[PDB]
């Protein structure tokens, strides 16, 4: 469907996976002699994980600048995404309730619990619903697909009642996630090249596109 399709990649891409456009010139989903991490289940799971994380990242990288330009948030906040303490050489914010290492330890424990339980459910489907977890195991059963667990919390409003609706929503999620991944890559590249925020780059380009682009930002 897309550009770069091949007869070899079409042997294993029959539209079963969500967002299958037959774009695989590097042949990473061939089930013939597959192992380790280069296999269809892990690759699709990693793609949906990167998609959701990049969606949150793109929104979180462009939200404080847009909210600051709109006057909703004060002037103490509204800093660039790479100047919020992420990279201390690029700038750090000292307005938090604690230093970034304490918050990092909190993130270590929190992310370890979430990610390790997610991994254990991927390795053993449904194993996160038997052991006692303060009664929360009733919603950690998931389904056969580790990428789409569902349940009372992960599917709060029980959307996608029909299989077609669920397929449509899955395709929308993967496309928005790919767009967000490209946006995050663009955010990093613009931060290294221009040295400013992404919304600032968008504004500067909208003012005069001929004098504001990658060709004029070289030197």
């Amino acid at each position: 469907l897309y550009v770069g399709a091949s007869q070899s990649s079409l042997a294993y891409l029959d539209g079963s996976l969500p967002g299958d456009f037959g774009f695989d010139p590097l042949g990473l989903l061939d089930p013939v002699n597959s192992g380790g991490f280069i296999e269809p289940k892990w690759l699709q799971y990693s793609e949906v994980i990167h998609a959701r994380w990049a969606m949150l990242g793109a929104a979180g990288c462009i939200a404080p600048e847009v909210l600051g330009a709109a006057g909703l948030i004060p002037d103490a906040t509204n800093i660039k995404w790479f100047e919020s303490g992420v990279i201390p050489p690029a700038g750090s914010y000292n307005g938090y309730w604690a230093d970034p290492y304490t918050i990092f330890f909190v993130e270590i424990v929190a992310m370890q619990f979430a990610e390790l339980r997610r991994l254990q459910d991927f390795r053993y489907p449904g194993s996160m619903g038997q052991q006692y977890f303060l009664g929360l195991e009733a919603i950690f059963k998931g389904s056969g697909d580790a990428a789409y667990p569902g349940g009372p919390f992960f599917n709060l409003f029980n959307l996608g009642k029909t299989e077609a609706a669920m397929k449509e929503l899955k395709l929308k999620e993967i496309k928005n996630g790919r767009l967000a991944m490209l946006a995050m890559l663009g955010y990093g590249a613009q931060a290294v090249m221009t040295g400013k925020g992404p919304f600032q780059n968008l504004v500067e380009h909208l003012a005069d596109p001929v004098n504001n682009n990658i060709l004029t930002n070289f030197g």
């Binding site: 254990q120 459910d121 194993s127 038997q130 052991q131």
Partner: peptide, 9 residues
């Protein structure tokens, strides 16, 4: 019974 690593036999 509960184990040190849930899901691991």
């Amino acid at each position: 019974r509960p184990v040190w690593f849930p899901g691991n036999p």
